[model samples]
Target chain A: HHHENLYFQGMIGVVATLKVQPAKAAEFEKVFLDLAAKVKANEPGCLVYQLTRSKTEEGVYKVLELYASMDALKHHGGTDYFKAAGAAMGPTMAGAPVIEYLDAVE
Target chain B: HHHENLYFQGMIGVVATLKVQPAKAAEFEKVFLDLAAKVKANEPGCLVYQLTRSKTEEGVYKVLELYASMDALKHHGGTDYFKAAGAAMGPTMAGAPVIEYLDAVE
Candidate 1:
């Protein structure tokens, strides 16, 4: 672990907690994976975009995201594709996602 | 994003939800960070051991761990250092950690 200073400062970090409709988990994951891949590939400023599901909680999923800057995060949300994808995922969600913006303090 | 099937099929995934004593949160995080670094460096089978704190929930920490296999995860718990670290963290915790194990879908 000689990787010093691996921590990013002033970067935008976000955690989106989603509770999916139980029967739609498989469908939700497929859609989210596509979104994850798209965000990783198309957004140069996007850094980490990992999807983690709660082991015990059947419908709980967390999207861990890190952006290069606040502007980068804004740009991500402003994208037409993301907006369309967001709308597409509505039926699979149990409710609106709980999103939390965070400061990554590694 | 061209990464084919980045998901681990049979790898063991663990989510340890730790609720620390409110006043001991800082102390708990320090000990946990040390443990994280050690796990990353010494345990080759341990794939991902990232620590995430809820943006809205203070004193709540989630450890997202992935192991190469179930045997690897057992090896992680069997380590003397891990045992010591676990013991050291007890006082800082509000209760026993809520640990759940699953397979990593991605």
Candidate 2:
């Protein structure tokens, strides 16, 4: 029997660094925005799902994600839409993505 | 006649990467959380103010911020509290913080 409460488990932050081909940047953003919209509507626990482009760096982007709890963060990676979006964006992106998991300081 | 609407303007994202002294990590985090709480309660346009520590890398942290517009972001860096926080954490930190600005892709 599990007795742990996710509400008290604490929040998680995800900083995803991505590289997009300059030529296909628009397409990459479009696909990402679509996935972001789905996550925003479907996942109430997903607080911030903002796709942001770097001001000083070319071909670089970061997905700023905040989850209410660890459970919410897990749900995000398990989404079919999330998988589909990754597959669609693979061609537009180059190099390995740097994904970092963060523990919220509270 | 300044008819420009800030409401129509898009959001801005900030990703600040910091390196903390391993011995003073606790002090650094406490100071950061104090500043985070202040920003959260005081700045309405400041959507997300999270101080997150890396799960993989020890003593590495990131400050994730989301502003309603460019103006909101400008206000953040100008606050006295922000300046005071930086000064307090200086001894507890190592290296220059790598701060990146981003344009939100809606």
Candidate 3:
């Protein structure tokens, strides 16, 4: 096949792993949900922005994010709400997140 | 907040990682897309069954799957098409996949 598969190259996917404070998991999510609201209300280009917990690991959380393009992704990080939420949730995090960037395929 | 976030607890998320044979990346994706079509057509419980490639690494692919429940996730692997797809895609793989199960949140 001479044609290269260029499926959803414009879509950017991010899997960010977080380890939350064991005792503050609920608090962390509350702040997270508040930020989620801001994201959904303001960002239409962000298709899927989800927070998930590990089925096997204790206090482990992950955010699965999809954006329309690199600009949309960059826009997400530069938002005031994102920064505010990060500050609010800072004390509840065990450490910095480990981020992985991916390209979506349909 | 004392309340535990019960958002999307009935849903299951999976991140499965694969590295394809260097020369067979295109072939691997073709087989994967065929499998994806069968999954979408046959498995109602399986949602968000998108295949993704790493933004930074070549020949590396990840399958992002969300299911209605664990039973739905199990049903996906037991299908004949899944097995057939696996068999067809086996030769193009570099090694066994790395899988992580997750509980979805809003």
Candidate 4:
């Protein structure tokens, strides 16, 4: 389902906030870039993919992602590359990132 | 050589801190959208592009970007799209964003 259609037809979103350690900043970069590349390969119905760094905090990062639907995210989770990357960065990263699901409204 | 093709020639670039309030946030979004679309269309040298918001403080936003070279930075400043967007958002924004130019140091 890598090539499955991911329609952002109605506006669905996923927000994540990650807290990292400054000492592992380089590691953080490696982890994120790896994910970016892997996701591009899988093409997990990418709507909006981003990586953000905090201005004041040493190793704070935020991700604001928009996906097509619940299916797209589920597809993402099922990808082996995602699973592998997450496992690789699990130790280097701080506690799990806070993930939030959102429903947009007019 | 790292492929020797896509060249990793990184350089110093400028930083812009735009603090757009909720009242005029829609306008701010439009202004940014216009610039983003225009840049992605016209600029070939842009290395990094981003938009961000503070976690605890709403309306507080920061943009972190990297460029291939100083020439790329200059190209952005001289572009009419940038000029027009800034003009459009001048009155709508809360205050003039503080811009900082940075030089990368290894």
TM-score of chain A of each: 0.85, 0.88, 0.88, 0.79
Q: Write the per-residue lDDT of candidate 2 for residues A47-84, one digit (tens) a residue.
A: 88999887656789999999998889888889999999
Ranking by TM-score: 2, 3, 1, 4
lDDT scores of the candidates, listed in order: 0.75, 0.86, 0.84, 0.62
Highest DockQ scorer:
2
Clash totals for all candidate models: 0, 0, 0, 0
| Residue-level lDDT tens digits of model 2 in B10-69 | 898888889898899989988898999999998998998998877656688988999998
Off by over 4 Å in 4: A1-17, A22-32, A47-71, A95-106, B1-18, B21-30, B47-70, B95-106
Taking the tens digit of each residue's C-alpha lDDT, what string does model 4 give over A1-106? 5432233344455556677777887887787778876775666576655565544455666664655566777787778887887787767776668875554221
- Steric clash pairs (candidate 4): none
lDDT of 3 by residue, B1-106 (tens): 3343433348888789998887998898899999999998888998778788986566889887889887888799899999999999999998788998788876
Q: Looking at model 3, give its docking quality level.
A: acceptable
Q: How good is the docking of model 4, by CAPRI class?
A: incorrect
Model 3 alpha-carbon drift over 4 Å, by segment: A1-9, B1-9
After TM-score superposition, the amount by which residue A39's alpha carbon in candidate 1 deviates from its true location, in angstroms, is 2.2
What is model 3's DockQ versus the real complex? 0.49
Any residue pairs clashing in model 2, and if so which? none
Q: Per-residue lDDT of B1-106 in model 4, one digit per residue for the tens?
A: 6463233244543345677776887777777867876876787777545554443445645554556576887798888889988789787777668765443322
Kindly report which residue pairs in candidate 1 clash with one another: none
Candidate 1's TM-score reads 0.70
